[PDB]
Amino acid sequence: RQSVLKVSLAP
């Protein structure tokens, strides 16, 4: 297509 352009529990 292109045009110019230490953890805790996880959901």
Next chain:
Amino acid sequence: MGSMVDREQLVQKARLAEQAERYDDMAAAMKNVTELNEPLSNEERNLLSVAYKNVVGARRSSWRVISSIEQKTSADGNEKKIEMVRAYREKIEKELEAVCQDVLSLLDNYLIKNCSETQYESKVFYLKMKGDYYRYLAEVATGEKRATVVESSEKAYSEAHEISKEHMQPTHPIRLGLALNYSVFYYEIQNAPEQACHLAKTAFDDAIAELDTLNEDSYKDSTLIMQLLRDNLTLWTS
């Protein structure tokens, strides 16, 4: 209540919003569903959590960037620039406090209140949530205001824990998630890594011992969280 508003259309909207990655819409729909005052299905409970986790999470992420900038900025000593950043960090804090308050109110006055003693997982899930959002308040708080949130987070995690010991397999994803975040509380908020490691290890070992208690529905989620426990364990240890 549901006789007035279609409860199932609301949940559908929430699913829809999740896919458009419109998490304010999503939380709004799930707040409303909660407010019908019926108890939340396991899916609905997830929708609610994901919605608010992304709404508060966006502020958290921005806060950490802006905080880091304030530290470097201050170093320079440019008055006007520092005040710009401190003002902006505060704007974001107040959005963050407001989202946490919305969640906590929901929890205390609708979610926790409604469920039975028999419904044990719901009770731990919501009690853990309460822990998390006081922890999110704790991350940006200072002085007296901070101690109060820390204590509140503590209290909420501590009770979530007792109920899970007595009534949940050490391999239950929720009892595992709780151990994860509670340990994170000890490391990051209390700056008590001794307790952090102990709790994260205690939970991990207990899970391993009973490795028989895994069902086809659990093994994916139980082991994934046991890894995180370990990942934090390894890290903090070093």
Next chain:
Amino acid sequence: VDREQLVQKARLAEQAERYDDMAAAMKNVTELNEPLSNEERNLLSVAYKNVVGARRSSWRVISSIEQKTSADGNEKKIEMVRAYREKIEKELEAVCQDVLSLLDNYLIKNCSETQYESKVFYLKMKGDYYRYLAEVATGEKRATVVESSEKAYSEAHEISKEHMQPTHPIRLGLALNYSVFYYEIQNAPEQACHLAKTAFDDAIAELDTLNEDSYKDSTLIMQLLRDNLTLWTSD
């Protein structure tokens, strides 16, 4: 809250990935009624590109769903998705009317005759945002905005082929986005590919004209024009 503070806030907002804040900041800068620096102009473009882009993305996901579930045929589930799409549409169109307004009342109107880079930049923007409108419009509404997008792209094209070098990144970017307009919106693959290849080959012909300041910008766009042609031809 003078001009240099506004820009400082736009910069902070970008680090925070708070693009509404960033758009609001640069909108206030634009409304001070003085020309934009290249930094400021890119801050403006980036802010609204992410603001509208969030909506474009949402709309597609929602649009994709409408098609798939119109099949299942429930007439109240179909109705809800249609509503949600329309909610998103009106947000997106509102962002676009806002940018276009900045463009016609401030940015474009404030170019002197000799500010060609600026005009090509702002006419290409105008072009872009009427295109965003065209992606979600239908009927005579679509025809009207598609026409507007074309009219802006086309004038930017001519000023750029007369006043800028083929390797110029604003000229190259115009070509890429304009080629996209031809492909996606006007459904004219042939006219798309010709425009993409011509701008690419013209750039190669004069590759020596890349200055140190923007060869990275020019070279990446050249990379995209190619990626496009590959994809568009290959089918």
